[PDB]
RNA sequence: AUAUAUAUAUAUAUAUAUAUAUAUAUAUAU
RNA sequence: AUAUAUAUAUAUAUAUAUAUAUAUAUAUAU
RNA sequence: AUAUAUAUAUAUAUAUAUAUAUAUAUAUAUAU
RNA sequence: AAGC
């Protein structure tokens, strides 16, 4: 899910409200006037005028964006595990976001990336000011390098391909999902790929210990209790970080769920 | 009323000062109380001929209310939620009809409960069923917030007031409190109950039972009725007991009715809670004519809170009210809710007072007493979704370019920063450095105390701990078959006894369970009960905050008991020309996050500890190695101490947030996990941290930011004249600012106003909402002062209300007596009319003194004789032919009060006893030739005295438990406690020395080895009792009652050997025409006379009793008083210093200071209060607000007035008798009604030596 | 702050190497033998034992005092303010007598060159009114805090 | 310390060190004021409206 | 300013402007005889009543 | 009837006090 | 009101024509202290830093003082009375010495 | 014996103020401070008086 | 998902009625 | 001038109605 | 309890002046 | 589940 996705939930998006902020500042009569006022001909905020820009902008964010973001994240968790992007961590903190939180930085000059990107709505300089506002909005925490995420996302799978690239996929594949008795109701949760011995070892685990409530193809569920610990999967058996909820081939039901090792017979 | 007098002739005549009290009449009245029925009480109500002035319209809207359907909905998370129509806060219970959800109850067809079938569809998953059941359960919970059925209180009020007006023994006249015919609340209560009941023959609108509530099937019943009835009965009781003006009571009733006629009763009360204060207290003395104001002085050091009283200063128009007028705000508030009239009469009445006297403060107290006193109740889901969903608004944040590289989780703050955070960082830096340098920090006993501090019998969310540990494949011992709760932190500690810290490291990131508390006139409060490892790792934060509060600022540690607070501070601050500023932080816990505060405090603490602590473990937490990146380019590793390891882990936890677990019992299908950043309320570091940050931010404003943000020279001079060490007092989120009056009068109000605006602006840029009040009044810790007079707030002590947050059933029968006595003492502190209050308290004690029980066809009645209440501290009225109303409730409790009143009326008692044929031949030292041994037995006085000391709670001890599992539990607890081998060696040395020397002198030596046993007993007693334990109660009480006795305890028999001699009265302590406590006035003679004769306690109690002990703090589980008593017993009984050394070694003190303290104690002379504890003599709780110390010192003369007598000689080495006899003199003087009287010792029957031998015999024999 | 941890390190090393260790009970044992009457309001032994309180952790401060001898060029060990009597004391008070005794024994071990003057002025302060001496000027009179010199 | 009674600690060394540090700072402001600032003022002055 | 400074024994200093004025009229100076007469009147009416 | 006042109630008791 | 814009504008022009840069990190490094004197509160090095408050980045006073030399005849630059020691101060107070 | 009646502690400032009006006001010590019957040196109480 | 129609809910504004409070007017009694 | 009753105007509350804006449910068309 | 003398307290009744705020008229700045 |  993109960072800006929360923006267009309101018919007037957050961006035009930010544009209209200018009316609350004395001596500024237009957004262009605001831009030339806040910058010093070298695309640097005056470090004081940006102060009142933040003064005016923060109530808008904390009074409008935060609640809609809260609902958006609450609904988003229902469809299953997702990758969420944001611009400042305080957005997620104030929205009571649930899940692992990562602050990542980049080995580039991000600010220069804006004004070259043509076809902007309110002008590139507005995007620069917006980026400065978000950076000031962020908390005080050291962001790790972005590579720490992509490495986990890719390298285990790429390594495992060197071992499983030849075996029969029927034996060396697995599936974890929510079981619902009335052929039989089953919605996938995690996809597992590993050698035969590893899958066989996985087969005898207490998958029935965790329960959730499934409602209904576009099904969606919600977990009660505690989430699944990572070591239950393995230090082996590289898996999928994200999943989308769907029922494979009719009244709307809210029966129950426990997850089962429906992986395979072989 | 005819049946009332018919049933309670003798009882009313006895408790109204006409006839002598007796046990048999008391029990007859108790039986009559037990024999009534609800409808009988209402028929009795029908017979009061109410007058016209008690009439007022009742809107018809209350009875007719819509359905509950439109007030609820289902969110996208399939959770029941409250639809809001009045704003963000309209999340309380709406006012809706209920009868269409009731299944008729068997054998009680007129009443019913929530439909069980609807419960079935609810548990299936139906939407409408879930809505209906949520509404039903929450309405039941709202109706369950009382102590006992209202009919008991109403009937007791009727019985008490049937006796008519009382005769004042001091004033020699009759009071003029209007009778029930002018009590508007009772008339409203009767009318509403009759209208609801209508033709149906049953009158009770609902029935309150332990299992819950049953509703009357009427089409006019509404969920808002129970709270309305509670408020009306409270007001009716208060009017008759405290002599309130009926005009104000009518306004209170009007407010209650308007609340009922609204969409949500609780929401309405919450939004309108401040009419009475804003219209009477905050707008008082607009035009001032005269009066007195006390002259108090603040001495040095002001850190000591030492104030001395000078006298009275006449007032003048120079000191009229000068704060900004609030007329517009009050009118707007009254208009917005349609109470503009009530505001109109309130203001008009307020303008009428021009002099500062007893009348004005009485009027203010009466006005404040009329506020509603319900416990606001709302479902937990809305509380969570309303309180944890707001975040701080850091309007001016710390620039990101002002941080170093990370050290594990922390990040060092540079010193070039333009932000104000630098001063906060410096303060915490120096605090940590000074803390870590104290040698006591490294003492094993100190660390053991800190570890034991958070090991209590209360919950700790152990389940989440369990699956968190299972998440890494670690199995804890189960302790199967233990008759104790697994959901206690003691259980958690037992399961965590022998695990490495590395294994339990992940446990800090576990979840958190739920916990709620309801308050009066305040939204329900939520709690996060942190688990054991979290409490362990939160230590350095707590220690640093403690150091700051103890040394670098002015901060109190008093509780919410009125006695222990600093009255002198408030009375000094309110008195002109001084002016006070009331500062509070709204949503204080939600305003402290990683963004501004935590990221700075954690870094400061971590850095300010490395030097004084390098390479040392702590609290079981060991040292470790972390990555270093502070300097640019170089990235290295760095060892850290145990405290720094805790800081790293706690920083991780703070950065992540918090994981709250919710299980809404009132809503089927409402349970989830909520991610929040709000600071926990259940941790040990909450209050101290909040106080420290409060003081630091205030000082920063006064020193740097404020001077740099205002230009008016008057404001600059004022601010430069203010410092926190001289003018600011803080505790948590509540703070008080004192503006000392200048030599030209008092500081200009405009300057104060602009300064207040400056603080309001200054609070925002780091996300603190400063709730500031400046109205010429002083408020601190919900204590209210005006012009040096404190105004008790009656509304915050509801007589009938009781906080119940869970769905559990209420307590067994005997428990309610504790609550009743607590109500009596609350009325005592609040200063009600003493005679009426005593009469009413007697009525209640009668109404609750009987209980039916079933013992398997042995249907018996449990009955408490009247004497047990007297032993519990409730004074008598008239007995043994004595004069009425000669005793005061400053009577002590237990043996002391008994001895006092016997000493006062011994001769009359003897003549009465003889005249009734209770005659014997063996002359007695106390009673001559009276046959007391049988009269006391038949009067049940011995029986009542002895059964008043039985534990009225079930003793879950002695349950069957396997030997192996119990010994495993005990050894696990001991292993957890005894970590460092040094402490174990110390305790072993102490045990060996004690066996060598101190064995055989006393039987119960406190020791660290007994802590596991006490912890096990406490955990076991925390479990739910069962039926056979209640049967054990019943049979024990019957055994005690049926038995026959021959004497009191040894201590009381010793006390009766002493007789005194009253003399001329004392000298007045304060001026007789100076109002100090509202209501304590000439119409309230006895409290007034006691206060003016003894004088108020002008020094805070916490610091006074801090010096009345040897060890300041001990391990949680042991009592410091027990250790002091054991030491003084050992010294008194002639044991040598090695025994005291052994005793000090058991509690873990190191050998050298053990010897030093033992020798010093042996040769030292101790205070009277500290020395009197050897015989369990404690200062009565009611005396705390009086200057008892000077009366101990210079008004209890142990030498007879006529000169030395033969028997009054104290043996030279028995000087502690000098300490004991002072308490006896104090009890005798304070028990008597009237002024304090100089008292002289008269005679001891057996001589001093015999009394000493008896006391030593008791001292040795106890503990068996 | 830059030099103090060095002194703690040296103290730890000294404690590791030295054969001297605290006698746990010597003071109490020798003071438990003095003869006195139980009828007296005051007891010298009580007061002295109360002021001493030998917490056994005192050898750390003793060791840092020893280590200070090697660095009088940059570090000047002095007696803290809190050790002196609060208001200046009085010879008639037993407590002040014991405080003077403690200071008199403690002072000669510090590296402060101005120590003897403070040792003298400590008694001079307690002795005011009882017994007088000529001082230099009106500022540093006989009633100044001894630590001011 | 003839004029600072009531200082229980001898702050002579600390005050002397701080004053010495302030004395010998590498502040180039006096250089600028003595040399360049008059030149800047002279250049600017004729162009002013006042 | 002279009178106020002298009356406060120099502990507080007040200042007056030094420039051409507007001839403000501030009548406050009277002879000693009038003060003595008023003092006698005051002592007279207060006389003999505590 | 006879609802006289509260201030007079206060003063009447005091007047009882002062009498001797 | 007439004078104010002239002095403000000349101050700005001098500020951004001169090669001189005001950098308080020089002071901070020279003092080279965070908070000395672990236990006893008196620490002159910290006190002088607190009084100076180097972290502030506004220096309009300096430029305005320089600009005032051109208009000696109509405007007089003086030190605000608030910068003087409180109540005249005393030599016994450490803060008064730094003032 | 040092605790004053009503703990007034105010006669000191009044006595200082009286120095300015000795023409019309003569501050005196009340009778109640003297011993009732004149006292006796054999009584310690009278010595303190 | 968009457009249109009907029902329901919320906010603002206006009007009427009832109740309460304030002001004005009339009558009886003093 | 006081007490009692009634009427009009203003304010608050409740109900009804109308208009505008927004949303939910049902149906038709694409 | 009756009569007389002295004194305190409550209730009823009567007058002036001033100041503050709001509103109307006139003008300046921003907007139309 | 139910804190300090």
Author numbering:
A (entry chain A): 443 to 624, 636 to 669, 681 to 713, 720 to 736
B (entry chain B): 2 to 1265
C (entry chain D): 530 to 678
D (entry chain E): 779 to 828
E (entry chain F): 480 to 529
F (entry chain H): 211 to 230
G (entry chain E): 530 to 628
H (entry chain F): 580 to 628
Q: What does the primary publication say about this deposited structure?
A:
Mammalian reovirus (MRV) is the prototypical member of genus Orthoreovirus of family Reoviridae. Here, we report the 3.3 Å-resolution asymmetric reconstruction of transcribing MRV and in situ atomic models of its capsid proteins, the asymmetrically attached RNA-dependent RNA polymerase (RdRp) λ3, and RdRp-bound nucleoside triphosphatase μ2 with a unique RNA-binding domain. All viruses in the Reoviridae are capable of transcribing RNA inside intact capsids (endogenous transcription) without the need of host factors, an attracting characteristic that allows viral RNA transcription of these viruses to be studied in vitro in cell-free environment. The ISVP transcribes its ten genomic segments, adds a methylated guanosine cap to the 5′ end of each mRNA transcript, and releases the capped mRNA from the turrets at the capsid vertices.
Anchored to each occupied vertex is a TEC, which is a heterodimer composed of one RdRp λ3 and its co-factor μ2 and surrounded by genomic dsRNA. We were able to model 680 of the 736 total amino acid residues of µ2. The atomic model of µ2 has a triangular shape, comprising three domains: an N-terminal, RNA-binding domain20 (RBD, residues 1–264, see details in the TEC–RNA interaction section below), an NTPase domain (residues 265–607) with a bound γ-phosphate group, and a C-terminal domain (CTD, residues 608–736). All three domains of μ2 interact with λ3, with a total contact area of approximately 745 Å2. At the active site of our in situ structure, the priming loop (residues 558–565) extends from the palm domain, blocking the synthesis of double-stranded product, similar to that in the crystal structure of the initiation state. These two features suggest that our in situ structure is at the initiation state. In our structure, the template RNA has already passed through the positively charged entry tunnel to reach the RdRp active site. At the active site near the template RNA is a density that appears to be the putative transcript. Our asymmetric vertex sub-particle reconstruction now further reveals subtle structural differences among the five λ1A/λ1B dimers surrounding each vertex, hereby designated as λ1A1/λ1B1 through λ1A5/λ1B5. Under this convention, λ1A1-2,5/λ1B1-2,5 forms the primary platform to which the TEC binds; by contrast, λ1A3-4/λ1B3-4 make minimal contact, as predicted earlier. Taken together, these structures indicate that the role of N-terminal fragments of λ1A conformers is to anchor the TEC to the capsid and possibly also to regulate transcription. We suggest that CTD guides the template strand of the terminal dsRNA into RdRp to initiate RNA transcription and the NTPase domain provides the required energy for this process, thus playing the role of a helicase, while RBD guides the template RNA out of the RdRp active site.
